[PDB]
From a paper:
Here we use a geometric deep-learning framework operating on protein surfaces that generates fingerprints to describe geometric and chemical features that are critical to drive protein–protein interactions. As a proof of principle, we computationally designed several de novo protein binders to engage four protein targets: SARS-CoV-2 spike, PD-1, PD-L1 and CTLA-4. Overall, our surface-centric approach captures the physical and chemical determinants of molecular recognition, enabling an approach for the de novo design of protein interactions and, more broadly, of artificial proteins with function.
We selected a site distinct from the ACE2-binding region, but overlapping such that a putative binder could inhibit the ACE2–RBD interaction. Second, we screened a site-saturation mutagenesis (SSM) library, which resulted in the enrichment of three point mutants, one of which overlapped with a mutation from the first library. A cryo-EM structure showed that the binding mode was nearly identical (1.4 Å backbone RMSD) between the DBR3_03–RBD(WT) complex and the DBR3_03–RBD(Omicron) complex. In virus-free assays, we observed that Fc–DBR3_03 had comparable potency to that of imdevimab (REGN10987), an antibody used clinically, for the wild-type (WT) spike and bound to the Omicron strain, whereas RGN87 did not. Neutralization activity in pseudovirus assays was tested, and Fc–DBR3_03 neutralized Omicron, albeit less potently than the AstraZeneca clinically approved antibody mix. Importantly, Fc–DBR3_03 showed a very broad reactivity to many SARS-CoV-2 variants, which is attributable to the sequence conservation of the targeted site and the small binding footprint of the design. The design was sensitive to the L452R/Q mutation present in the Delta, Lambda and Kappa variants, but introducing a single point mutation (L24G) to relieve the clash between L452R and the binder led to the design binding to Delta.
Numbering used by the authors:
A (entry chain P): 1 to 65
B (entry chain M): 332 to 527
Write the structure that this text describes.
Amino acid sequence: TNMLEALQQRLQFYHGQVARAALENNSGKARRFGRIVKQYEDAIKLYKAGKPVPYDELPVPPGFG
Amino acid sequence: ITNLCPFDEVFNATRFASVYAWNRKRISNCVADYSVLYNLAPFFTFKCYGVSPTKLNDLCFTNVYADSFVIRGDEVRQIAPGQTGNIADYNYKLPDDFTGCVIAWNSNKLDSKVSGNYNYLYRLFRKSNLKPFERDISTEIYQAGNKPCNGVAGFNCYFPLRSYSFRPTYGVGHQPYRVVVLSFELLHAPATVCGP
Ligand SMILES: *[C@@H]1O[C@H](CO)[C@@H](O[C@@H]2O[C@H](CO)[C@@H](O)[C@H](O)[C@H]2NC(C)=O)[C@H](O)[C@H]1NC(C)=O
């Protein structure tokens, strides 16, 4: 499963979280989730460029299966 | 009848409904002066279907429905009969036969906070495309994969809808555009929304 599918999976899950936070009218939660999405898209861009992907630097994912 | 139609109210709304839950407004028992749209709104895209704008100010309608939502500028072209796309297939669908107008204008000043805007929402994942002039406000988790989940999770379930992140820094393509769609039927049998 390597890294690319997992990265897109986390990206989609956190996009859904951002959308849910926006739907709940929560401001700070939406902003923080959007920032997390920003770092995750930076990380996936870095991995696509060939640079190594980290584990602890990025926030931990939920109970993915 | 002489009372004016509430076009100013719908064109001057503080916030437009999200495209996945596009607002539907009834306009009836009033005189509709469309010269307001031409005189005001310096920036607009009034390209209309089934009737010329001047003739539109001329003739008499009988059923006016106003649909309002927010669409990114790059994908504003998806609002048209017989045209595909994520917005057309998932959020708002126009029938192949269509007699009505579409108005679109940028709203970076109004609907893009300096830090960022997230109020507006749109749908990306669903099983089947929307039928014309049909609304879908369900938020059930998509069954993208072969694993039923009943709740949001990492694997191929996902959230059916997505949020925009409008900011003033974005270019004209990504900037939000306030889109309002008017629908007409010119059979004129009851003629309740007749013009001047
Ligand atoms: C509210 O809508 C109206 C027209 O739909 C505009 O407000 C004024 O409308 C009159 C005509 O009735 C014009 O002469 C004025 O110039 C309009 N005001 C401004 C500031 O242009 C306008 O489109 C909307 N109001 C605002 C503040 O944008």
